[PDB]
Write a protein that binds this ligand. Sequence first.
Ligand SMILES: CC[C@H](C)[C@@H]1NC(=O)[C@@H](NC[C@@H](O)C[C@@H](Cc2ccccc2)C(=O)N[C@H]2c3ccccc3C[C@H]2O)Cc2ccc(cc2)OCCCCCNC1=O
Lengths: 99, 99
Amino acid sequence: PQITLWKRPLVTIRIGGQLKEALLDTGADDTVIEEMNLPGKWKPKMIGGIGGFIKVRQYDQIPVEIAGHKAIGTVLVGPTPVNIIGRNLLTQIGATLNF
Amino acid sequence: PQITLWKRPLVTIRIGGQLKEALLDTGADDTVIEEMNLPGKWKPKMIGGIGGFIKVRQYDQIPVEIAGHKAIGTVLVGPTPVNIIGRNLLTQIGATLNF
Ligand SMILES: CC[C@H](C)[C@@H]1NC(=O)[C@@H](NC[C@@H](O)C[C@@H](Cc2ccccc2)C(=O)N[C@H]2c3ccccc3C[C@H]2O)Cc2ccc(cc2)OCCCCCNC1=O
């Protein structure tokens, strides 16, 4: 689908059997979801953005369905203001910026 | 043009007579430019991102040319690690997300 940017590009995703709303973020290298219980082993990690660095739990090969499109990749879980879909998963569903 | 997301979506912009490299960010509500001496009156502001908040100076009606696309709007100047072109300016150049 073609998404204009007048409003925040928030879409419904499905992860861990749960449906959530996430922001399609082209400025985020990785995908960071709000604290939740995800199956499997996780590795402590530190990511940085605007405002500072935060500690996250890194999960690998996590299946995520974005607007009906399937992706399987790394998902970081931590104290984020909003669920973010980064370039690691955006490239999987073939998302591009057009103008 | 069509920009893929394998790497960070960096483009050349023109602001205040200077050519800069900025990141096309669909996850940013506003546009944040690295510290530069822009003339005119500004309003102090605090924007929140991933690791917290940072203080910026808000300039309005600033002309910014994005890859040959003339746009004009609010620009926040602060200690950002990278120039960020937000939705306020992306909507003006007709930018969309497609997948
Ligand atoms: C610059 C971003 C502005 C300040 C902010 N947006 C973000 O921070 C949004 N994402 C910001 C990123 O697109 C910016 C982008 C800028 C950058 C780029 C390269 C190197 C350093 C910093 C970044 O942080 N990127 C980092 C990131 C984010 C998530 C996961 C991994 C990583 C790694 C790194 O790329 C998420 C958000 C947060 C609070 C929100 C709403 C959305 O509250 C609600 C809105 C609050 C007011 C509006 N604020 C925003 O739109």
